[PDB]
């Protein structure tokens, strides 16, 4: 289902943003998780450039720099 699928996200900031904040954050804490800021929501939160539209060319630069360390 859409709500279940949106909560079964691999990124805990996107998951924590909209529903069951407490539950998602508790799960992420006991999982020792990390999210690499790939979804639009994640990058809207931390005030970065979304990987869509005009920010795509930027964010693929960061991808290539992740490639070479």
């Amino acid at each position: 289902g859409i709500t279940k699928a949106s909560l079964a996200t691999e990124s805990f900031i996107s998951a924590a943003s909209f529903q069951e904040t407490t539950r998602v954050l508790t799960e992420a804490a006991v999982a020792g998780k990390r999210d690499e800021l790939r979804g639009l929501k994640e990058n809207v939160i931390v005030g970065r450039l979304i990987p869509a539209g005009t920010g795509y060319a930027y964010h693929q630069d960061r991808m290539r720099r992740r490639a070479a360390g």
Binding site: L40, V44, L49, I50, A52, G55
Partner: protein, 1340 residues
């Protein structure tokens, strides 16, 4: 005709004769609060009820008790007006006589050990004004009535809870006025249950076990006995024939040697009459049939003394054998039919683990107080205090009444304590409804909904305060001293006053009056909410509550209701509605006797209505009163159909009985969709009162009532002849007979000039009488903000043409001429208040003074010496209003400022400026300045000037008061003296005080003269004593807030004019935002070159179905047309006879209109004054559902020589060529709404920033920025615009270094962004980290 009506008679197209005049429109508020105060001797209401409810207070021991005697309301310190100016609650002190009796505990009841009587002060209670309002903290508030679930018992039943089962399951609920709810219910397996205080479910019978009921008594109560006789051969059963409904014979029933029912068949009703005629008493019953039945009572072994079968247990063969063995020859069982008498109590008893009273009480305790180990006394006290205590439980008079109504009991009254009979009856009726006899109740019925007005909620809050007091009073009476305790010592006004003062100022139902209009007031006071304490929530409200209900007809308006989230919860009282003595709405109806429709009027509630059959107001009647049609349309049992003429019980009173007051003012309401009628009724409240008030040419005849009953006008208290009219007072000299014997007979009305309303509009009054002209009781002497000769006038009528105009009327836009702006006819005055407070800071007091640093003599030109603007000074945004400067301390400046001040040698002063200045974008004219100073601070020069002027004007006003009164009194003396001795030389040349001791013939002459000598004495005493009182009040200090030395309030007065953006509307739900102020020469013009004031779209009418605006338009064009005829008769100076002929022809026009006005009885001056008042257009009344018909509209249009089609040939203003096909033109009444674009336009480049999140939020002058919500973030993500998004997140909102750096970049001319991380993000990081959760940022 009346004096204020003989001067402008509105032509009435109503046809049904009106038989009940509308009630005083505010009687709900006035009557309610008068109940809350006025001293009830017996039938406790209000303050007396609250006192008698709490007092007497007995001490915990019984040694002494506190006793109540009486109460009295003191005079309020300041009147309504003074409280408005000072900003203080308009209240009255409450003073309660009390008695402390002390008994001796040695002697049995040695009552006289101490008697102590002393009046005590407890709380102040706000008083209601004469117009249904309270003056709380200087602001005028209204408490709206409440519609809540009436106390009592409600049987409901939810359908399809266990949707798989699909089985309806029932419940009963007892809702007391005060106390704990009691909820019986069923469960899918037909098991009864009780849910006390919404706690866990308990087997219902457990409650009976708490009431001294053993299983034998329970089954004796709830079931019916079946007798078995072991009559020496196989279980002879005594039979009752009527118990044999709907069964199947599992054995052959044979009596008297006759077989009646053949085995294997269904028992039929013919068989039952057979058994009844044959009088059969006893039938043999097989021993296998008893294996299912259940024993009623508890049968012991009477041979030895032991038990055999426990009560409510199912008999079997062996148990039956044992019972027969022990000498038991009679057996009782329970009649448990699957159809009519289910086994509900039996099964519940079976599932009940409790076995005696104590265990049931313990189970109650463990449910109510889980975890606490119960005891005997604790459990007993808890259960007894639940429902059987008069302090923690009240069903109330209404509650006991509704209870007995839903229990068919006979006595209306009773006790507020639940009995055993009451719980038993509730259980029995719930069981009935489960069986099938009777049916549930619906909650939305207005016979189950009740109105709690201001008097009643105020009483409840006062009683809550009294409980708060009685706690501590008991604590002090039990322990403390006795002989040295007066009652005044042990009471505290704070707990009581706090309760009442919280209700009148902070309740959800206590709210600021809507003072945009006289209608907006009078419809805020008739509101009826379903929220607040004991009501619903706008988000947990269902749908059944919101939708209309057939019992709303005549009690609540179907049309008027807000269309937001409060769609059905808030709604307005109907026109003729009232409230019963129990708070249930009720509506008038003419009684019908023998076909004749009688004149006497009965108010029927929502329940005594249903069983009658009520005709409609549209049904035609003859002179006698009989109906004309045979099959009158009527309604009964909540549904409508056609009935005979002799089958009819009641008739409606007027065709406006179903609508509210605001929907009763829409003309042609029946021709509009109820969606547009709803919107029209809602917008008609927000009309701003314009500069000059102009009557509506087409109204519904209800305007006079809404204007006179709002108290926005000045109605005469008594008749008489006007003595002195002024722009600000009307002195009227009363008639001789209307004059009370001892007083002068002079009424003085002090009209209230330009005064702020709650909404920053102008409450102004204007005399509408002329010097030396007669007036009667009830005649309007002074118009209000939005009235016109006594009729409400919310807006102004102008020439509307329905046609498109070059796209300037697209999608509800309005194209308004410029001749409408030149004439200043939608110009509204907006008074505003600005306040400057001088406060004590830690750096020193703040000073209000002219000398302001870093400001030239330019700005200070308008301030007077003390630093406060002159009255009359035309100020504009940015101008200083009062010069206030605060002490300032060391300002840490940068080295560069250090160099700057050490080069030019200019060190800034140690005093910062915080002067009050006009908010930006505002102009205006300071019309009033008020200075408030503590009692103990020297008054600056201007405070002294204001004080001197107000003192002098007050003294002069009182002097003129007494001078006029005593001049009229000397006139009275002379009038009585011309009887019994007329003296010319000695009587007049004496000063009029030469009757204080002189005497003449002993008749009423010298009696009145001695009366007025005593009046001399005590009225000199009056003059000087209360004049000194006003002097003291004027010069007395003020109870300002702690830390406030003085406050200055400045009152601008803006004058707003029409402009593109100002929302206008009409009475038919047709809004519009003015799009262009079109030059006069461009408006479409008629064939006589008369242009069109407003051009509206014709595409608004079709899909909205507000056809009324069309009809009104046509009718308007008829009305104005008649005016023009009269205009051309007055300008051509034609004889009064020609005007009388034409005007008389203009009134008696309708089909069979109710009105008849005969101008033969008018004197020629009266006709000429009427004609002068009609020359702007003859006003017309079109009652709501009794309107004017197109036949009459067109007869009118023919009377004024207009196109009967109501639709003319318009030429274009610009190109001068005729519009191809005729256009409809006529006078529509428009209203300027409260949505002035001046107040709605707002902009921001930079300003205030919030404290925690560091994100835009001003508001004082520059408001907070536009919220860029989630949906707009989605929209930008959709466009792919990542950079616009990034700047709208970081550098426009939160990024601090970013925001300032990018302001610098913009000023440099470089448009570039250096964004960081928003503040809100790492605020979130801190907040997550403080939950002991280590969230970080994995750096590179």
């Amino acid at each position: 005709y009346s004096y204020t009506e003989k001067k402008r008679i509105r032509k009435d197209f109503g046809k049904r004769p009106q038989v009940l005049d509308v009630p005083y429109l505010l009687s709900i508020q006035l009557d309610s609060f008068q109940k809350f105060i006025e001293q009830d001797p017996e039938g406790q209401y209000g303050l007396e009820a609250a006192f008698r409810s709490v007092f007497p207070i007995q001490s915990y021991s019984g040694n002494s008790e506190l006793q109540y005697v009486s109460y009295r309301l003191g005079e309020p310190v300041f009147d309504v007006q003074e409280c408005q100016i000072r900003g203080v609650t308009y209240s009255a002190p409450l003073r309660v006589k009390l008695r402390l009796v002390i008994y001796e505990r040695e002697a049995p009841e040695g009552t006289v050990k101490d008697i102590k009587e002393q009046e005590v002060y407890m709380g102040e209670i706000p008083l209601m004004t004469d117009n249904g309002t309270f003056v709380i903290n200087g602001t005028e508030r209204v408490i709206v009535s409440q519609l809540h679930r009436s106390p009592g018992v409600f049987f409901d039943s939810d359908k399809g809870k266990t949707h798989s089962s699909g089985k309806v399951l029932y419940n009963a609920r007892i809702i007391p006025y005060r106390g704990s709810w009691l909820d019986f219910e069923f469960d899918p397996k037909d098991n009864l249950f009780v849910r006390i205080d919404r706690r866990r479910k308990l087997p219902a019978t457990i409650i009976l076990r708490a009431l001294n009921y053993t299983t034998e008594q329970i089954l004796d109560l709830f079931f019916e006995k079946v007798i078995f006789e072991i009559r020496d051969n196989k279980l002879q059963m005594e039979l009752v024939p009527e118990r044999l409904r709907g069964e199947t014979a599992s054995f052959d029933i044979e009596a008297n040697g006759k077989v009646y029912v053949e085995k294997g068949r269904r028992i039929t009703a013919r068989h039952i009459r057979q058994l009844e005629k044959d009088d059969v008493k006893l039938i043999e019953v097989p021993v296998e049939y008893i294996a299912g039945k259940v024993v009623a009572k508890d049968y012991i072994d009477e041979s030895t003394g032991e038990l055999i079968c426990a009560a409510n247990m199912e008999l079997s063969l062996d148990l039956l054998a044992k019972l027969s063995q022990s000498g038991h020859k009679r057996i009782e069982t329970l009649f448990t039919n699957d159809l009519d008498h289910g086994p509900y109590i039996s099964e519940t008893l079976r599932v009940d683990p409790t076995n005696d009273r104590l265990s049931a009480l313990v189970e109650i305790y463990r449910m109510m107080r889980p975890g606490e180990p119960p005891t005997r006394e604790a459990a007993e006290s808890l259960f007894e205090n639940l429902f059987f205590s008069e302090d923690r439980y009240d069903l109330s008079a209404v509650g006991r009444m509704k209870f007995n109504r839903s229990l068919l009991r006979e006595e209306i009254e009773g006790s507020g304590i639940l009995s055993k009979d009451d719980i038993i009856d509730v259980m029995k009726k719930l069981i009935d409804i489960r069986n099938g006899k009777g049916e549930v109740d619906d909650i939305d019925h207005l016979g189950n909904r009740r109105i709690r007005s201001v008097g009643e909620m105020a009483e409840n809050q006062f009683r809550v305060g009294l409980v708060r007091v009685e706690r501590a009073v008991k604590e002090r009476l039990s322990l403390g001293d006795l002989d040295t305790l007066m009652p005044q010592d042990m009471i505290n006004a704070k707990p009581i006053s706090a309760a009442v003062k919280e209700f009148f100022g902070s309740s959800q139902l206590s709210q600021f009056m809507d003072q945009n209009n006289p209608l907006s007031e009078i419809t805020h006071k008739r509101r009826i909410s379903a929220l607040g304490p004991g009501g619903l929530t706008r988000e947990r409200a269902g749908f059944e509550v919101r939708d209309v209900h057939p019992t709303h007809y005549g009690r609540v308006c179907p049309i008027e209701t807000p269309e937001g989230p409060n769609i059905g919860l808030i709604n307005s009282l109907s026109v003729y509605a009232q409230t019963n003595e129990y708070g249930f709405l009720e509506t008038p109806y003419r009684k019908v006797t023998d076909g004749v429709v009688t004149d006497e009027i009965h108010y029927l509630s929502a329940i005594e209505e249903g069983n009658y059959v009520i005709a409609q107001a549209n049904s035609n009647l003859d002179e006698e009163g009989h109906f004309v049609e045979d099959l009158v349309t009527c309604r009964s049992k909540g549904e409508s159909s056609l009935f005979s003429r002799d089958q009819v019980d009641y008739m409606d009173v007027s065709t406006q009985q179903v609508v509210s007051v605001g929907a009763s003012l829409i003309p042609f309401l029946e021709h509009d969709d109820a969606n547009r009628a709803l919107m029209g009724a809602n917008m008609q409240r927000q009309a701003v009162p314009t500069l000059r008030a102009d009557k509506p040419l087409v109204g519904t005849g209800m305007e006079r009532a809404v204007a006179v009953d709002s108290g926005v006008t000045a109605v005469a208290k008594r008749g008489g002849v006007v003595q002195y009219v002024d722009a600000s007072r009307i002195v009227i000299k009363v008639n001789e007979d209307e004059m009370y014997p001892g007083e002068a007979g002079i009424d003085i009305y002090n009209l209230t000039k330009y005064t702020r309303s709650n909404q920053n509009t102008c409450i102004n009054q204007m005399p509408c009488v002329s010097l030396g002209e007669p007036v009667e009781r009830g005649d309007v002497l002074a118009d209000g903000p939005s009235t016109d000769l006594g009729e409400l006038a919310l807006g102004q009528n102008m020439r509307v043409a329905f046609m498109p105009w070059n796209g300037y009327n697209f999608e509800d836009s309005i194209l308004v001429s410029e001749r409408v702006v030149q004439e200043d006819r939608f110009t509204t005055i907006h008074i505003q208040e600005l306040a400057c407070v001088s406060r004590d800071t830690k750096l020193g007091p703040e000073e209000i003074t002219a000398d302001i640093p870093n400001v030239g003599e330019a700005a200070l030109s308008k301030l007077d010496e003390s630093g406060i603007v002159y009255i009359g000074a035309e100020v504009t945004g940015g101008d200083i209003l009062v010069g206030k400067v605060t002490p300032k301390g060391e300002t840490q400046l940068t080295p560069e400022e250090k160099l700057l001040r050490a080069i030019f040698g200019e060190k800034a002063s140690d005093v910062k400026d915080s002067s009050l200045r006009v908010p930006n974008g505002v102009s205006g004219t300071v019309i009033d300045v008020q200075v408030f100073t503590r009692d103990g601070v020297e008054k600056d020069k201007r405070a002294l000037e204001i004080e001197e002027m107000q003192l002098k004007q007050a003294k002069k006003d009182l002097s003129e008061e007494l001078q006029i009164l005593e001049a009229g009194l000397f006139s009275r003396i002379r009038a009585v003296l011309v009887a019994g001795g007329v003296e010319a030389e000695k009587l007049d040349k004496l000063p009029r005080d030469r009757w204080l001791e002189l005497g003449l013939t002993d008749e009423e002459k010298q009696n009145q003269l001695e009366q007025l000598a005593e009046q001399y004495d005590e009225l000199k005493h009056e003059f000087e004593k209360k004049l000194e009182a006003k002097r003291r009040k004027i010069t007395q200090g003020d109870d300002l807030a702690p830390g406030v030395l003085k406050i200055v309030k400045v009152y601008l007065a803006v004058k707003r004019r029409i402009q593109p953006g100002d929302k206008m509307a009409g009475r038919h739900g047709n809004k519009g935002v003015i799009s262009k102020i079109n030059p006069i020469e461009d408006m479409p013009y008629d064939e006589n070159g008369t242009p069109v004031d407003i051009v509206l779209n014709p595409l608004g009418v079709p899909s909205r179905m507000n056809i009324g605006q069309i009809l009104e338009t046509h009718l308007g064009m008829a009305a104005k047309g008649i005016g023009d005829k009269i205009n051309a008769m007055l300008k051509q100076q034609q004889e009064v006879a020609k005007l009388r002929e034409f005007i008389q022809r203009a009134y008696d026009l309708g089909a069979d209109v109710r009105q008849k006005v005969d101008l033969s009885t008018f004197s020629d001056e009266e006709v000429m004054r009427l004609a002068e008042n009609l020359r702007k257009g003859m006003p017309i009344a079109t009652p709501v559902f009794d309107g004017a018909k197109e036949a009459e509209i067109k007869e009118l249009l023919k009377l004024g020589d207009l196109p009967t089609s109501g639709q003319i040939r318009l030429y274009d203003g610009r190109t001068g060529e005729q519009f191809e096909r005729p256009v409809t033109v006529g006078y529509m009444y428009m209203l300027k709404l409260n949505h002035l674009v001046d107040d709605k336009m707002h902009a921001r480049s930079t300003g205030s920033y919030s404290l925690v999140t560091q994100q835009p939020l001003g508001g004082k002058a520059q408001f907070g920025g536009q919220r860029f919500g989630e949906m707009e973030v989605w929209a930008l993500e959709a466009y792919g615009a990542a950079y616009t998004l990034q700047e709208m997140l970081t550098v426009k909102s939160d990024d601090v270094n970013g925001r300032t750096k990018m302001y610098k970049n913009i000023v440099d001319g470089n448009h570039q962004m250096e964004p960081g991380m928003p503040e809100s993000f790492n605020v979130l990081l801190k907040e997550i980290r403080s939950l002991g959760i280590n969230i970080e940022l994995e750096d590179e």
